[PDB]
Amino acid sequence: GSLTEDGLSYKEKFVVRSYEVGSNKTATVETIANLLQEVGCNHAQSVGFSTDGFATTTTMRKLHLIWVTARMHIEIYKYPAWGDVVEIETWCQSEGRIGTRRDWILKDSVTGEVTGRATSKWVMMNQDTRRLQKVSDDVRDEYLVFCPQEPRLAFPEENNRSLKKIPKLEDPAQYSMIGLKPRRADLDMNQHVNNVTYIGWVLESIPQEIVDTHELQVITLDYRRECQQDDVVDSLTTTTSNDSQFLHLLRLSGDGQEINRGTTLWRKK
Amino acid sequence: GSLTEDGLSYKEKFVVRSYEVGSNKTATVETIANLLQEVGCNHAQSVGFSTDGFATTTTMRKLHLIWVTARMHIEIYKYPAWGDVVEIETWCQSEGRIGTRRDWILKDSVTGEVTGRATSKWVMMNQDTRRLQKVSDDVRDEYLVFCPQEPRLAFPEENNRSLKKIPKLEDPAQYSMIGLKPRRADLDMNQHVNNVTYIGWVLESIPQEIVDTHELQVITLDYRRECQQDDVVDSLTTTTSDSQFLHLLRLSGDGQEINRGTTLWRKK
Ligand SMILES: O=C(O)C1Cc2ccccc2C1
Ligand SMILES: O=C(O)C1Cc2ccccc2C1
Numbered sequence: 001g002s003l004t005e006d007g008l009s010y011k012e013k014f015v016v017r018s019y020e021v022g023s024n025k026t027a028t029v030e031t032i033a034n035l036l037q038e039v040g041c042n043h044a045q046s047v048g049f050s051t052d053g054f055a056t057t058t059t060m061r062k063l064h065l066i067w068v069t070a071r072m073h074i075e076i077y078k079y080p081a082w083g084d085v086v087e088i089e090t091w092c093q094s095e096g097r098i099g100t101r102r103d104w105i106l107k108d109s110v111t112g113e114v115t116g117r118a119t120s121k122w123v124m125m126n127q128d129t130r131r132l133q134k135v136s137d138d139v140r141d142e143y144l145v146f147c148p149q150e151p152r153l154a155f156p157e158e159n160n161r162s163l164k165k166i167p168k169l170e171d172p173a174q175y176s177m178i179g180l181k182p183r184r185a186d187l188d189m190n191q192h193v194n195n196v197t198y199i200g201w202v203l204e205s206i207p208q209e210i211v212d213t214h215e216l217q218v219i220t221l222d223y224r225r226e227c228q229q230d231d232v233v234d235s236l237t238t239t240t241s242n243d244s245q246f247l248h249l250l251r252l253s254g255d256g257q258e259i260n261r262g263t264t265l266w267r268k269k
Numbered sequence: 270g271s272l273t274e275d276g277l278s279y280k281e282k283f284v285v286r287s288y289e290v291g292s293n294k295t296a297t298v299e300t301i302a303n304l305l306q307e308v309g310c311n312h313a314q315s316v317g318f319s320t321d322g323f324a325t326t327t328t329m330r331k332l333h334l335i336w337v338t339a340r341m342h343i344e345i346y347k348y349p350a351w352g353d354v355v356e357i358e359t360w361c362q363s364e365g366r367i368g369t370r371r372d373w374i375l376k377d378s379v380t381g382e383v384t385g386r387a388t389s390k391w392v393m394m395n396q397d398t399r400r401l402q403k404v405s406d407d408v409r410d411e412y413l414v415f416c417p418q419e420p421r422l423a424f425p426e427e428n429n430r431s432l433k434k435i436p437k438l439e440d441p442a443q444y445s446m447i448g449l450k451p452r453r454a455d456l457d458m459n460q461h462v463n464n465v466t467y468i469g470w471v472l473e474s475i476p477q478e479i480v481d482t483h484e485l486q487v488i489t490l491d492y493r494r495e496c497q498q499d500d501v502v503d504s505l506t507t508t509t510s511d512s513q514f515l516h517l518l519r520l521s522g523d524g525q526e527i528n529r530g531t532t533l534w535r536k537k
Contacts, residue, residue: 017303017307018306018307018310018311018458019303019306019307019457019463019465021458022453022456022458023458023460025320025321025322025458028453028454030454034286034288037287037288038286038287038288041287042287045352051294051351053294082320082458083314179448179450180452181448183449183469183470183473184291184297184469184472184473184480185297185299185469187291188288189287189290189291189292189294189351190292191292194288196288200452200453200454201452203453204452204453211453
C-alpha cells in the first residue's frame with residue numbers, strides 16, 4: 001500500500017483468502033470490515049500516527065486522549081470472490097469540533113469499477129476517565145496536514161442513509177441469539193473487543209433462511225458502550241420491511257444495558 | 270505465491286495485519302494457523318485440485334470422498350510482528366494407505382531464518398456416510414505426481430513430539446471455559462466449523478496469567494469429531510508440568526469428545 005501522489009489519501013490491494021469467504025465463495029461483510037480496518041491502520045502509520053494500537057497524535061498522547069468509533073456504515077454492491085484482488089482507497093476529514101470521519105471506496109482492481117463504499121464517525125475520549133469530549137484546536141491543526149481541505153465524502157447524496165437516526169428495538173424481539181461472548185481472537189492488541197466482532201454479533205440473530213436467499217447490501221451500526229472481555233451479549237433483530245430490512249440491538253445478557261444498535265438492508269440473490 | 274522450480278512444493282509471502290496480532294504486537298497462533306491453511310489451499314489450486322471448499326482429486330469426486338484432518342502439530346520459534354513479512358513453504362506426501370501429510374516451514378523473509386514449522390495428518394472419508402477409509406491405489410497414483418518421492422519431513426527428529434500419543438484428560442479439570450459456540454465467521458465456505466476455530470477453543474481455558482507471562486512454543490491437536498454449527502463446546506485444561514498442559518474439548522451436554530491436545534509454553 002501507499003499514499004497517493006498528493007499525500008492526502010492511501011490505497012492498498014488485497015487478495016481474498018480461502019478462509020475469508022462464505023457460502024457464495026465471496027468475502028463476508030466481516031472480511032470486508034477487517035480489510036477496511038487494515039488499510040485505515042496502514043494509512044495512519046504512513047502519516048506519523050502511533051503504532052501502540054490506539055493510533056494517536058503527539059498532542060493526544062500528552063493529554064491521554066484516544067479516538068473511539070461512534071458509527072460505521074458500509075454499502076457493498078458486489079463482494080469479491082476467493083482469489084480476486086480488491087483495491088481500497090481511504091482518507092480522513094475533520095468535522096469541526098464534533099469529531100473526525102474516515103471514509104473508504106472499494107474497487108474491483110481488474111475493471112476499476114466501484115464495488116463498495118464506507119464511512120465511519122469517530123469521537124475523542126479521555127483514555128483514563130472514558131469521558132467523551134470535543135476536538136481541540138491543536139488536534140484539528142494536526143489533521144489539516146494529512147486531510148483534504150475541500151469536502152471529500154464517500155456518501156455525498158442529499159440526507160443519505162449514513163446519517164439516519166436509528167431507533168431502539170422494543171421487546172419482544174422477533175429473533176434473538178443469546179449468550180454471545182468474545183474469545184481471545186476477538187480482542188485487539190490492547191485487549192479490547194475488535195470493532196468487527198460487534199458486526200458478527202449483530203448478524204448472528206438474522207435467520208439463516210435470509211442469509212441463504214439474500215445478500216447484505218447496507219449495514220449501519222452505532223457503538224454506544226464497549227463489551228468488556230468478561231461480558232456476555234444478547235443479539236436481537238426485528239424485521240422492519242424484494243428487499244428485506246431489519247432493526248438490531250446488542251445488549252448485555254444480564255441487566256440489558258445497550259452496547260450497539262443498527263439496521264441492515266438485504267437484497268434477494 | 271507460486272510452485273517452486275521443481276513443481277513439488279509451493280511458497281507464499283504474507284504481510285502481518287494489524288488485526289492479526291495479540292498483546293505482544295506479534296501474530297497469534299490462530300493467525301499463523303490461518304496462514305498455513307491459506308498457503309495449503311493455494312498450493313492445492315495450483316496443482317489441479319477442486320475449488321469448491323473440498324480440495325478433491327478427479328477420482329475422489331467420482332467416489333464421493335474427501336480428506337479430513339486427523340492431527341495438526343505446530344512449533345513456533347518466533348512470531349512475526351505487525352507489518353513483518355513471513356514466507357511459508359508447503360508440500361504434501363502420501364503415507365501409503367494410512368493417509369497423507371501436509372508439512373510447512375515458516376521463515377523470516379528478510380533474514381531467511383526458520384521461525385516455525387508444522388505438520389498435519391489427513392485421512393480419507395466418504396462425504397455421505399462420514400465413514401473413515403484407507404487410501405486407494407488410484408488416489409495414491411495422483412499424489413505421486415505433485416509430491417516428492419523421497420521422504421521430506423518438517424519433523425525429522427527421532428520419535429519426535431509430532432507423533433506422540435495424547436492421553437484423555439480426567440475430571441476434574443484444573444481449568445475450564447464452558448458454553449463456547451461457533452458464530453458464522455467460524456464457518457468455512459461449506460458451513461463446517463473451520464479447523465482453526467478448535468485451536469482458539471482449546472486455548473480459551475489457559476489462564477490469562479500464563480498468556481501474559483509465557484509464549485506458546487508447541488501445540489499438538491487431535492480431531493476426533495466435528496462440532497456442528499448448532500453444537501456447544503466445553504474447553505478443559507490441566508497443567509502436566511516451561512509450562513505444559515493437557516487439553517480436552519467436549520460437547521457441553523453429554524460430554525462427547527471432539528478434540529484432545531497438548532501445549533508447551535516458554536517464559537517470555
Ligand atoms: O475500526 C476501524 O479501524 C474502523 C473500520 C471498522 C470496521 C468495522 C466496524 C467499525 C470500524 C471502524
Ligand atoms: O485446515 C487445513 O488446511 C490445515 C491447516 C490447519 C490449521 C489449523 C488446524 C488444522 C489445520 C490443517
